[PDB]
């Protein structure tokens, strides 16, 4: 049964598709998607399959030509638009792991101009990964290949891991001790051929001693971090930046770490009959020495965030090209509350890291808002309250005294009854001091980014006359004082049909000739026939997750 919709992108869109049960395991869905503003039919083509080697799905979208795409680059050889997507995952005999997340597109604009079914207008790159691994109880090895279609033409400089091979051995009856060892090898390559190629083997054996009490806990962890680099094609890079990269580079270092945890109980007889409370502090000491890593071009090491759990974590960065001169002690606390039914009705956690030395990597040119190199530089706290059965609230905050400011923080409050009857408010913050620090210059000094994040959400649904069901969501950036995403939907249902219709005004680009934000609109009918399975929910969920800032439920 066909569909249509009007969009600013394509005016009259309509999509009239014939499904094919090829067999069990497999089936198709071929779909002519007529696009008026473009003057041709996109040919959307889906394939799903099933095996012992798990399942996977494939999409080929072929627009053979495009009115609107010829009129902005008229002297071009062709003008077609396409996409290919492959998803796979599967575990064969528990031991063999196969995975694919593949996405390729004809152009930067593809998710703006057409549908956000596998990609999305929100995305900035296309993910292109394959990986095979072997895994057992005490051991797992994995190889993969990660490449990335960077979209916007600010830079196409994407590093890709072709391939990368991670190995992991685990031994836990070494008497009182426990051991893991990890070994990794990867080869880094760039789409621009005037950039550093490199190869990187790395070994990291880890031994620790964990101590079991009925009310306490301590582990102590010794680790080495041996890494060898080879770095080709450094003629160009070494003439631009003063700091040379050395062809062969070695960097070895170790880590003393120790983690303490205590559990105090009591009873909330004062406030509630027959309640409980727990309260846990925690400390980590962490020592890792300085190494001048400025001879290594950072390939896969981006700065991590530190929510409260992530205070008690032994890495400033991901990847392995940057590791900090940690000397520091983390401290945090976690009050919990149970009821007569032993259900966690409320928690809260706050933590902080005191640094005795600096934390460096010889490549410390992130622009902070001040000079503090030591002390309680980082704080975080989440919190959960289940006020009521139908009601709850979440929230958290990350603080840094090198920003003078909060970094990031996020509130939520929710009402739910069932999947048809619910409301949610939400807010994320991000300081323009944080954007200056964690991101490149042009983010920091152009209009659409620099001013950070401040973001207010409303999401809901009311079931009317059992058959109907309304949905919608307003999302609102308060700094610039503008809408980001706004959706309204309605869903009539019954035991032989389920007609759905909705509306989306979303952000969809930024005009540089006027330097204002460009929006996109979309409205359309969308149908299906119930009866031939137990598909009898009033269909809210699908609709709540259609919008570009999808609905994320907070606990029950």
């Amino acid at each position: 049964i066909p569909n249509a919709k009007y969009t600013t992108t394509n005016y009259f869109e309509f999509y009239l598709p014939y499904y094919w049960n090829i067999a069990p395991n497999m089936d198709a869905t071929i779909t002519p998607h007529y696009m008026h503003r473009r003057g041709n039919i996109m040919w959307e083509n889906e394939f799903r399959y099933l095996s012992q080697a798990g399942a996977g799905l494939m999409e080929l979208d072929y627009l053979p030509s495009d009115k609107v795409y010829e009129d902005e680059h008229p002297n071009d050889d062709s003008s077609r638009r396409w996409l290919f997507y492959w998803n796979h995952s599967g575990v064969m005999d528990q031991v063999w792991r196969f995975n694919v997340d593949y996405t390729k597109v004809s152009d930067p604009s593809y998710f703006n101009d057409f549908d956000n079914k596998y990609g999305s207008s929100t995305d900035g790159y296309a993910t292109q990964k394959f990986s095979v691994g072997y895994a057992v109880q005490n051991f797992n090895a994995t190889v993969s290949t990660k490449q990335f279609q960077v979209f916007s033409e600010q830079n196409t400089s994407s590093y890709s891991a072709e391939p990368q091979l991670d190995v992991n051995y685990y031994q836990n009856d070494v008497g009182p001790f426990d051991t893991r060892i990890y070994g990794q090898a990867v080869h880094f390559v760039n789409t621009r051929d005037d950039m550093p190629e490199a190869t990187r083997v790395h070994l990291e054996p880890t031994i620790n001693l964990p101590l079991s009490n009925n009310w306490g806990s301590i582990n102590t962890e010794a680790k080495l971090l041996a890494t060898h680099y080879q770095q080709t094609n450094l003629d160009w890079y070494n003439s631009r930046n003063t700091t040379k990269l050395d062809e062969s580079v070695n960097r070895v270092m170790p880590q003393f770490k120790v983690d303490g945890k205590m559990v105090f109980e009591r009873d909330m007889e004062m406030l509630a009959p027959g309640y409980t409370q727990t309260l846990e502090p925690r400390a980590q000491y962490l020592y890792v020495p300085y190494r001048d890593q400025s001879d290594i071009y950072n390939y896969d090491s981006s700065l991590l965030q530190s929510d409260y759990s992530g205070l008690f974590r032994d890495r400033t960065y991901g990847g392995l090209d940057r590791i900090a001169s940690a000397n520091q002690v983390t401290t945090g606390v976690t009050s919990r509350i149970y009821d007569d039914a032993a259900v966690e009705r409320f928690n809260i956690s706050v933590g902080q890291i005191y640094y005795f030395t600096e934390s460096r990597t010889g490549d410390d040119n992130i622009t902070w808002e001040n000079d503090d190199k030591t002390g309680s530089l980082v704080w975080a706290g989440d919190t959960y309250w289940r006020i009521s059965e139908r009601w709850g609230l979440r929230g958290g905050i990350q603080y840094d005294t090198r920003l003078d400011n909060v970094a990031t923080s996020n509130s939520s409050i929710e009402y739910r009854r069932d999947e048809d009857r619910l409301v949610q408010l939400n807010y994320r913050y991000a300081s323009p001091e944080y954007i200056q620090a964690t991101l490149p210059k042009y983010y920091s000094t152009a209009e659409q980014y620099k001013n950070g994040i401040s973001q207010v959400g409303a999401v809901a649904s009311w079931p009317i006359a059992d058959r109907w069901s309304i949905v919608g969501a307003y999302y609102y950036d308060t700094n610039a004082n503008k809408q980001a995403d706004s959706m309204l939907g309605v869903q009539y249902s019954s035991c032989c049909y389920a007609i759905r219709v909705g509306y989306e005004r979303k952000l969809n680009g930024w005009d540089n000739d006027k330097q204002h934000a460009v929006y996109d609109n979309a409205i359309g009918f969308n149908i299906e026939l119930r009866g031939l399975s137990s598909n009898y929910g009033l269909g809210t969920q699908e609709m709540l997750r259609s919008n570009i800032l999808p609905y994320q439920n907070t606990l029950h």
């Binding site: 400089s157 079991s212 109980e265 896969d300 039914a341 996020n410 952000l507």
Partner: protein, 150 residues
């Protein structure tokens, strides 16, 4: 008016229990085994004809990465990973009490270093795998309680 805790996070009917899972060598069943171990539990196999043993039948995970904030231009400022994990615990004498866990992390994006950022993820996803396991350990006391009524 405090005091220190007078058992572990796990009940005493579950110092012995089976870890039935559809994917023994997965990255969930990996990080659960490790967590029960860290409360000193005697894990069996599903071979044992022995008895009195409850059985934590792990179910399947799911992980969206949802765009969760947007710059003025409309390009995801901040994703958010969301792990959802559904288990069950069987009690040989009695009944089935299905339980679960959900975690959120979230992080900023950067296409300029999209490779680095995909890495960051794997970690966060990993980290989650444990955070989840724990949430399930913290739900066992609630199975222990609400059951005693019947």
């Amino acid at each position: 008016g405090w005091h220190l805790r007078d058992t572990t996070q796990v009940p005493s009917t579950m110092k012995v229990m089976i870890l039935d899972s559809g994917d023994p060598n997965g990255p969930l069943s990996r990080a659960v085994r490790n967590q029960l171990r860290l409360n000193g539990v005697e894990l069996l196999d599903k071979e044992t004809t022995r008895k009195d043993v409850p059985s934590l039948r792990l179910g399947k995970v799911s992980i969206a990465k949802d765009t969760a904030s947007v710059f003025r231009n409309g390009q995801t400022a901040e994703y958010q990973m969301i792990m959802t994990v559904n288990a069950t615990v069987l009690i040989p004498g009695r009944d089935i009490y299905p339980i679960s866990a959900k975690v959120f992390r979230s992080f900023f994006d950067n296409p300029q270093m999209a490779l680095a950022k995909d890495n960051e993820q794997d970690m966060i996803v990993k980290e989650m795998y444990d955070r989840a396991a724990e949430q399930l350990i913290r739900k066992l006391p609630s199975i222990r309680a609400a059951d005693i009524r019947s």
